[PDB]
Design a protein around this ligand. Sequence first.
Ligand SMILES: CCCCCCCCOCCOCCOCCOCCO
Ligand SMILES: [Mg+2]
Ligand SMILES: [Mg+2]
Ligand SMILES: [Mg+2]
Length: 435
Amino acid sequence: GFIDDSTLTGGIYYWQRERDRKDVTDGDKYKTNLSHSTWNANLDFQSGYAADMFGLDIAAFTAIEMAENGDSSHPNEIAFSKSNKAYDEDWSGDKSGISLYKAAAKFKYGPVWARAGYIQPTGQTLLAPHWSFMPGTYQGAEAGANFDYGDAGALSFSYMWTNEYKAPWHLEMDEFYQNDKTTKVDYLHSFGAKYDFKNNFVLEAAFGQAEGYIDQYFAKASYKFDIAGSPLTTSYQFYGTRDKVDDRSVNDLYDGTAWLQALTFGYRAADVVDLRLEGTWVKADGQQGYFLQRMTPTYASSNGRLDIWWDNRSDFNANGEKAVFFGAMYDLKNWNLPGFAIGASYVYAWDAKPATWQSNPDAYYDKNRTIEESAYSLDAVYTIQDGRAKGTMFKLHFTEYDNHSDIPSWGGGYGNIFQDERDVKFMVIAPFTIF
Ligand SMILES: CCCCCCCCOCCOCCOCCOCCO
Ligand SMILES: [Mg+2]
Ligand SMILES: [Mg+2]
Ligand SMILES: [Mg+2]
């Protein structure tokens, strides 16, 4: 029951990074952009259900700075921002702290479930937290249902409503606003569904809104089949967004519907190497000039579901842009190094356009330009196989990112693109169980 089925788990985390970026307004100096060493640690209590109907979850984490270079930018998203509320953010520093990231009543009744309080989305909608080591947190509620039809498939759906949020690098919640940071968005809500036909074919879709401002869409089809005894997995994904401000004010983001479509393939070869081939295509006409999967435009103010992630620094999400990604991860078990893996990946993207109009354009703004970007990354991972520290993981990731233009960072009507970088991340993740 509620006591007997309780669990208490957590982890200790270590992160060290060095990233530099080209300033094409001072020669082309690769200047320090991030340089810090930071710890996290968390405790997560999840109760059982009294009478199979009522429970409680409570979880908290701390972040402790260890080193930071004076030229490191802020916030680094592993420590806490010195600005506790997202809409106060002024980019001037980072700090240590303790955050309550889960605190919720949970309910079950037949096929129905619900959660309320300080929560993460967990069902079928398109709301989502940001993830660092730990997730961001919404103030609100979600309810959903699950119906199993045996071999004929299974249906799930849910609805969530929220009026405040905090990213994992913010110690306090803030409300929602339009692009101007002052016109109120009273709530975000979303409804979605999933149908699993139990033949490896699965459909998902969802709709969301930011009150008075943005309508958001999500749809995904996936399928897998065996090729030579091993599954090839495929998916088609659609993300869309439309706004309700088209007067050419600061709050006017998109002309028409903006969207991102994607195709993915995955396959494990010779039972030893995981291969990925993926591509994306974006349309984002209007003042902003890039696609967002979240329903509020300001950095850190909320997040939305996005199943595409290439860990190659850029978002590759500019108006018109096409991108293709290839990744390989090689399991070294047959060299008798079980738990050891090495990888490499590459991206090439073309046809990236800027915003279609600008109110105070800069020297470099050219409505009809197109640009390109590319990147490649290397990866090394080791997970402890047995003993006291079984499952503790060490990871090293290197990216080299190349902007194929001379436009300075964030300039030219390309408001989400920055300049060439080199990035190195080292992390350690050490989970534990108390009971
Ligand atoms: C201009 C709309 C484009 C939508 C693209 C297709 C996305 C497929 O999934 C969307 C599922 O959403 C269902 C719509 O929900 C109701 C919308 O109407 C509500 C008020 O306008
Ligand atoms: Mg295989
Ligand atoms: Mg081999
Ligand atoms: Mg370059």
